[PDB]
Structures are given as structure tokens and as C-alpha cells.
Amino acid sequence: MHHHHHHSSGLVPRGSQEIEAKEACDWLRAAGFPQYAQLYEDSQFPINIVAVKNDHDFLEKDLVEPLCRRLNTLNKCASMK
């Protein structure tokens, strides 16, 4: 029943982009960064992804790929400025 996350990976893009949108928000929360997920419906996803991910927040760079990809997949739909 109780858990924190599933796994720490994400390298399989497909045409199912409307289903990837669900997994994007939920993965951000699971990975320990729910602030980013909640900012989707507030129209605050596009806030310099490459800058905020480069603040050296964790030691491992493998976590920075899905932090980029899950932001990017919703960015298309958000279209803010």
C-alpha cells in the first residue's frame, strides 16, 4: 500500500503523449519534487527548465533527464508565452 516512488528511470518516447501527460505530473511528485507538478494547472511549467535543473540540487545527473522530459512533454500543451 504505502510507497514513495516506483523506479528512478525514463527513456521511452511514444505517440501516446496524452497518457505521458498523466505520468509526467505523478512522476514529479513521486521523485520528491511535487512543487513542479502542481505548477502545471497554474500555467507555470515554462520557467527556464535548463536553468532550474542546473542549480546542482542533487549529485546524480541521471535524475536530470526525466526532470527535463516530464517538464518538456507538458510544455507543448501549456504554450505559455
2 falls within a domain: no
23 falls within a domain: yes
d(CA 8, CA 10): 7
Looking up cell 505517440, which residue turns up?
15
With beta carbons less than 8 A apart as the criterion, state whether 25 and 31 touch.
no
Which ranges in 12-78 belong to alpha helices (H)? 17-30, 34-38, 49-52, 64-78
25 falls within a domain: yes
What CATH number is associated with residue 55? 1.10.287.2070
**Structural domain span for residue 35:** 12-79
39 falls within a domain: yes
5 falls within a domain: no
Which cell numbers hold the place of 71? 517538464
Method: NMR
Please calculate the CA angle 28-63-46 and round it to the nearest 5 degrees. Answer: 50
d(CA 37, CA 40): 6
d(CA 2, CA 78): 32
d(CA 25, CA 62): 18
Domain count, the chain: 1
